[PDB]
């Protein structure tokens, strides 16, 4: 059941980043919050497209 797995993995990555990331680098084009917003939006889009493809 890939939808739930993609969501859980995505959440695990976001939460790891939140605990690890003691000094976000500005040259990567975003802030932690900017990254988090984009990550959650990308995952949503990814999972919704998968669910449409498969059923």
């Amino acid at each position: 059941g890939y939808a739930g797995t993609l969501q859980s993995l995505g959440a695990d990555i976001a939460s790891e980043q939140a605990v690890l990331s003691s000094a976000w680098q500005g040259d990567t084009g975003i802030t932690y919050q900017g990254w988090q917003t984009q990550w959650n939006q990308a995952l949503e889009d990814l999972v919704r497209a998968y669910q449409s493809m498969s059923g």
Partner: protein, 67 residues
Amino acid sequence: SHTAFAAKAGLMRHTIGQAEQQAMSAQAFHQGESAAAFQGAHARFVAAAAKVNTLLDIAQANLGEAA
């Protein structure tokens, strides 16, 4: 930390590829299933329709002017 991130990043990339292949296979299967189901039902419909037309032919012939 870093090997933990690596593990998760790698699994996410792998899982995205697997999900894609699975979904492509699922769609192909669903299109085939829908077509097979329709073809079968259509064949049953055609057989039943031919029976109905046959029975109507018989009834019209039998009844003649009484139809």
